[PDB]
Amino acid sequence: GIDGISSNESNIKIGAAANASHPGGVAAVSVQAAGAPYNAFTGFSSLKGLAQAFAAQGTSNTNVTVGSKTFNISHIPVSAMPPSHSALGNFNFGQVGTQEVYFGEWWKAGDTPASASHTVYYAGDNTNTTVPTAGTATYTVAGINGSGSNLLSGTFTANYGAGTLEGTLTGTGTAVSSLSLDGVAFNPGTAAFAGLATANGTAGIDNSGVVQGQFFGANASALAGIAQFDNVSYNTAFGGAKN
């Protein structure tokens, strides 16, 4: 019941954890090089709890309002964590409201989001997903790009009948200051989309973006995805709530 992608499965895998309330499982992430239990699939919900549990030492878990929508953001830096959790790595990830939709990034202890280990991912429950075949909807979108405190944000427009997803995000303190979808599309009535993207920011314009994501929930109440660029500083994960 869980779908999702990781830009680098040698660092991060996305998958399902068993749960008494979800026969298809709950969204989870596995850190390939971490100590137990974090090398198994760990529910994002448990990582949310860890971010709360270590908040006095530098982690955080915050409800952030974007437009009229809430995104729950978890920030887990290696510097805030005990030494045996060094191999757990650095996390920034968000949840689309209380929907079972997560999106975020990771990088290795001692690296930065500019390093090759900068990995982006999304994960979500597909059990109830239905995608309209006609009409249009907009989504309030938040994006994570090397920060848990300065989110990308903007509006994506889904044209369900044409099968297109369009829009632009901007940032106020991340590597990426603007990111535009280019030709991102999906078969009408189906959940998965993909296309290209262009970003601008601290390293200049980068037209090499590749976008992959999907709709989630009844009547496509959410979306999430990732964008990868030749410059991994610009690698971005995003999640949207249907307006």
Same domain, 71 and 157: no
- Among residues 73, 71, 6, 2, the alpha carbon closest in space to that of 212 is found at 6
Same domain, 4 and 48: yes
Same domain, 112 and 190: no
Same domain, 160 and 241: yes
Cα distance between residue 242 and residue 212, in whole Å: 18
Structural domain for 205, as ranges: 129-243
- Determined by which method? X-ray
Same domain, 71 and 136: no
Residue 29 is encoded by which pair of tokens? 């992430």
Domain boundary residue, one of 128, 157, 172: 128
Do the beta carbons of residue 212 and residue 225 sit within 8 Å? Answer: yes
Do the beta carbons of residue 129 and residue 191 sit within 8 Å? Answer: yes
Same domain, 167 and 117: no
DSSP 50: H
Same domain, 1 and 109: yes
- Among residues 75, 88, 93, 4, the alpha carbon closest in space to that of 38 is found at 88
- Among residues 133, 57, 73, 144, the alpha carbon closest in space to that of 104 is found at 144
Same domain, 122 and 12: yes
Residue 98 is encoded by which pair of tokens? 């209380």
Domain boundary residue, one of 95, 128, 161: 128
Domain boundary residue, one of 83, 103, 128: 128
Same domain, 241 and 217: yes
Same domain, 5 and 113: yes
Same domain, 47 and 156: no
Do the beta carbons of residue 132 and residue 10 sit within 8 Å? Answer: no
> Which H or E run contains 226?
strand 222-228
Same domain, 95 and 135: no
Resolution of the structure, angstroms: 1.9
If one counts the domains in the chain, the total is 2
